[PDB]
Amino acid sequence: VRVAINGFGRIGRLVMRIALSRPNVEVVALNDPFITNDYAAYMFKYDSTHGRYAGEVSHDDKHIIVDGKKIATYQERDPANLPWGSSNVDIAIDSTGVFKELDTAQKHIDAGAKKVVITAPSSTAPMFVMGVNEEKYTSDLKIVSNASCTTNCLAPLAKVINDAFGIEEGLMTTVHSLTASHKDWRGGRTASGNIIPSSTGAAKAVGKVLPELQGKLTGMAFRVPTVDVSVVDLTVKLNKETTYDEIKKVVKAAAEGKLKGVLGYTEDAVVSSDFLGDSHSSIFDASAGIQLSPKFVKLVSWYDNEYGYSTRVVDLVEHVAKA
Ligand SMILES: *[C@H](CC(=O)Nc1ccc(Cl)cc1)C(=O)OCC
């Protein structure tokens, strides 16, 4: 599968790290009009939380070069101008966050890509979360969205819980790290010393990938100045009586079976930085959860804000291509 990345921000760069390691994905090109090749190579090589790239990174006038692989670079403000057809690009991965609707991401198909994966929620493109609704994807869909990182954490867990005990209602909190203000006053305050309440649309987004949960979840976030690992805190009313031991067994079974690699499970005394670089969408913290009564429980799940999501992007890219 031949892929091109639009945008060299954190997501674009981690998607490239992951895709370079994928045996059946080949990174052909990168587009970003706001950076130079030497700055691209520098940003790809060094990462404050995911470490130096384990490999040789360099550049020339027309490429970024990684372990001898030459990746062509472009600086087109308008993606319709990109030589995707000329380069035989199968999937265009758009991580800019600005071509995230059907009419805008269409520019990549116009440029000659066969399909587009948007690494951000979309109001018009169908959203897919691996482990949740990827079997609903049909090969005639040419433009798809991978939803958000918080949605990717919450949705696989909410599906497991709802399938086994039934979710009647749920309220969610996410303790959310900085990495990713007339419109949002709290968020314009200094990150450094502050807990900063925020709204988040993840609990509603779950209603779009799990329609049976539509209208059953809402929540908010507390932003804090920590490494880019976040944690969801899901307080749910259940349909069926259960015990926490049974919740643990069901989640662990899903993590070891059908949701392997997407949903993780731990009983260790972890803290947020223990999940830097974790490729799971969601890591259930069995020891942090707490049940009060047979149908009332608090579930805790971790996620690396960028890395699990980027791994899912490449997962979706491969899935959409095999179709
Ligand atoms: C996941 C990264 C992320 O958490 N972004 C973010 C969400 C909410 C707030 Cl308040 C700030 C930052 C992700 O989906 O990134 C792609 C946009």
CATH number, domain containing residue 34:
3.40.50.720
Within this chain, do residues 73 and 63 fall inside the same structural domain, yes or no? yes
Hey, how many other C-beta atoms are within 10 angstroms of the C-beta on 194? Answer: 14
Reduced to 3 states (helix: H, G, I; strand: E, B; else coil), residue 287 is coil
List of residues 6+ apart from 133 with CB closer than 8 A: 209, 210
Within this chain, do residues 224 and 185 fall inside the same structural domain, yes or no? yes
User: Cα separation of 197 and 178, whole Å?
Assistant: 12
Q: Which residues span the domain enclosing 15?
A: 1-147+306-323
Q: Whose CA is nearest to atom 10 of ligand 1?
A: 198
Nearest CA among 148, 141, 140, 151 for reference residue 122? 148
CB under 8 A, 24+ apart: contacts of 63-72:
63/37, 64/30, 64/37, 64/40, 65/41, 66/20, 67/20, 69/20, 69/27, 71/16, 71/27, 71/28, 71/29, 71/30, 72/28, 72/29, 72/30
Supply the CATH number for residue 182's domain.
Answer: 3.30.360.10
Within this chain, do residues 231 and 298 fall inside the same structural domain, yes or no? yes
Active-site positions read: 149
Within this chain, do residues 83 and 158 fall inside the same structural domain, yes or no? no
Q: Does residue 120 have its Cβ closer than 6 Å to ligand 1?
A: yes
Q: Does residue 174 have its Cβ closer than 6 Å to ligand 1?
A: no
User: Cα separation of 11 and 29, whole Å?
Assistant: 15
DSSP state of 298: E
Q: Does residue 199 have its Cβ closer than 6 Å to ligand 1?
A: no
Q: Are 117 and 144 in contact (CB under 8 A)?
A: yes
Ligand 1 binding pocket mutation candidate from 150, 196, 303 (most atoms within 8 A of CB)? 150
Q: How many domains does the chain have?
A: 2
Q: How far apart are the first and last CA of the chain?
A: 12
Q: Are 37 and 63 in contact (CB under 8 A)?
A: yes
Q: Are 222 and 196 in contact (CB under 8 A)?
A: yes
User: Cα separation of 86 and 299, whole Å?
Assistant: 49
Is position 32 annotated in a ligand binding site?
yes
